[PDB]
Design a protein around this ligand. Structure first.
Ligand SMILES: O=C(Nc1nncs1)c1ccccc1F
Length: 163
């Protein structure tokens, strides 16, 4: 079984009327939930406006994120994986022979790409061996940076969030 941390979604922006039960009934549409909790004040029991759900598998987390936007008890909520929320990555280690279609063909399966920038030397024009990829949504980046490995154009790449 995949590590539990990788099967969790934090859910922000909840209606204060959302309960453990109503959050569960909503998100069980996309997989088996092993946990589902609304965070509440310890004294008033008033909702803190966020909670988390834990799916049985990572593919179920993906299904839930692919079904955004989620309207839960009348309010559009904000699900995020286990936050520095950005849409852009640095990709290093691609050397000189890696081209845009290499990066596109690989990264398009994580999310919709809006910008690919292969970095070149300001003086010579030679490729510097790294690039930036911008997606239309942060979950692409979140899926990417939790992978242990990225292989693009036969190169073992270093990938990190870019600010
Ligand atoms: O910015 C991109 N490529 C180029 N950048 N300079 C010339 S063409 C790009 C954007 C979205 C999807 C695929 C892409 F390649």
């Amino acid at each position: 079984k995949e590590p539990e941390q990788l099967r969790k979604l934090f859910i922000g922006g909840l209606s204060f009327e959302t309960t453990d039960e109503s959050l569960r009934s909503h998100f069980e549409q996309w997989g088996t939930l092993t946990d589902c909790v609304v965070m509440r004040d310890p004294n008033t029991k008033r909702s803190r406006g966020f909670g988390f759900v834990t799916y049985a598998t990572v593919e179920e987390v993906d299904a839930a994120m692919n079904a955004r936007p989620h309207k839960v008890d009348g309010r559009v909520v904000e699900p995020k994986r286990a936050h520095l929320t950005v849409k852009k990555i640095f990709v290093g280690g691609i050397k000189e022979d890696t081209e845009e279609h290499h990066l596109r063909d690989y990264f398009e399966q994580y999310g919709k790409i809006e910008v690919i920038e292969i970095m070149t030397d300001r003086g010579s024009g030679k490729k510097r061996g790294f690039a930036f990829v911008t997606f239309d949504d942060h979950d692409s980046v979140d899926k990417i940076v939790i992978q242990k490995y990225h292989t693009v154009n036969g190169h073992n790449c270093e990938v990190r969030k870019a600010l």
